Symmetry: D6
Subunit: 64 residues, 12 copies
């Protein structure tokens, strides 16, 4: 089971989605601009994407 | 009476609305971007949705 | 004289306006996104509306 | 059951405690400096006190 | 010389401009969303307008 | 009835208290450090003092 | 395995510690003032306590 | 060498650009909304413009 | 009339006070930690000092 | 190996991209508005661009 | 070379120091309260400790 | 003339002072906790120190 996708920094949301879903079929992908403060609630099926102005993944996606 | 919809994380606002209204007919649904600070005022008939950039429910909806 | 409109949570700005103006003819209605910090200056003729992303009234409108 | 103590603005935490406990025997009193942002979690047995630099109640205490 | 326009709360930026310029011919009108923090620099010829989502004047315009 | 004390900027909290109470016998005086964000709730009997590091009144006290 | 201690709201840090350690022997207890923003990093052995000015547990302790 | 343009408050970005470039031929003009916090890094060839909602210069442009 | 004291950066609050009072006999000196956001209210008789952890003047004192 | 591009302040994102990629072929370019707070995670292959309203590079690009 | 100390969460600053210095003899240990925003500047010899109110390490120490 | 002291990260304020004053005799040293936002005003004779909880220099001191 993987929990992080270091190889996705700089890639678009379309192609980060395709990778994560290949590796984590029940993933609930959430797309947030970098800098958003999240409430501390852990979900194992969730994968948050923090994107830049061009909607490219800006940081390492992790489950939570 | 239900007060939370864990099964709605990742779903769109259209289909989260349909579920909540099935379960909570007098629900007043409020849609806010994740990260918004709310004033601490409890309403039993209110259901706030915290959405991502794609307007998908990002966190567990709860009454309040 | 009324000072609050609890029955307006979840309604649109068009129809919150109509209600307030029926009850408070000299009302100066101000529409702000939820989360905006206001300067502490009291105006008796003012009614601020704090709206969600769909421009629905998110909290209880009060005079001030 | 009361849910608010308007008559406690300006009073000390010692004497706000005594009043609330007279009226709400299972009250869990929480003392926070004014300006603290709280997580939106409703507790019926909780009474938060927002105090000034002199630990005097600065705003109207309410259950939540 | 006037320094404040209490009668402009709720009016649009077009018609607040017309009033201020009638009363203060060298006015440099600056339009900011309510909630913006300004740097503390005093200008006698400046009039800042703090507007709501509908671009209506939300607070009392003052010189500075 | 007075609602503001421009003549109190720079004075200590002890002597601002004495003035306000002379003019406003039922005043509930609240002492907050400058910069504190307050919840928008109007109280006619309340007088908030915004103080500096030396507990001197830093801004013009007003009722609210 | 328990992950939350609803019965600890209002209790002191000394006696919240004793309870958690009875139920979760490898717990790493972290004490933070309410309002602190945490980095989103999940630890199963960690239990964060959010305390008020009197160091009483202010919110429901949860593992993470 | 000039380092500030007090006469540019209220003017548009097009005509502030023309002035600055007349006076400071190697100027790197940066346009930011008023309220943006900048990292403390000094550049002698840079001129930041802090603009209002109408893209009018809101504060005194300075080199840095 | 002077309005700024560039020569006071790095000096203590005791000796900045002595200078300002020599030059501005009716000065109301307010001492705030650097970083404090002030409400935009201009007072000609006020001189705010923004100090570091050692209470040394950190920035250029100005009237306002 | 270069780690900073001082000569790119004021240039557009298109032409900053071309320069960085000439010098750092595996660069993952991330475009963020000035003022965005980033999580402290170091990546050697990443180059963040902090842009103004006109998408011009506002600060010195560095690897990280 | 190690870059992280997962086994130090919950331990005091005295004993986190001893561990890090055993593993990283030239370490420059910096102790910050959890929640502090740092400037994005990478130092290989630096190890920041984010501590709780009891000065216990609250998060995983990493080099940077 | 030096403008930065990379070799001072981790050292105390007493001994950072001694170094800077050896190299920059007219230095006005300002000590601020890490995380403080400064107003963008450049002073060539100023050296700001950003310190941790133990008053150790946490970041690279620079003139400004």
């Amino acid at each position: 089971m993987k929990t992080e996708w270091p190889e996705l920094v700089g890639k678009s949301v379309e192609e980060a989605k395709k990778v994560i879903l290949q590796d984590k079929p029940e993933a609930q992908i959430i797309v947030l601009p970098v800098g958003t403060i999240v409430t501390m609630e852990y979900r194992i099926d969730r994968v948050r994407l923090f994107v830049d102005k061009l909607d490219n993944v800006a940081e390492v996606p992790r489950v939570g």
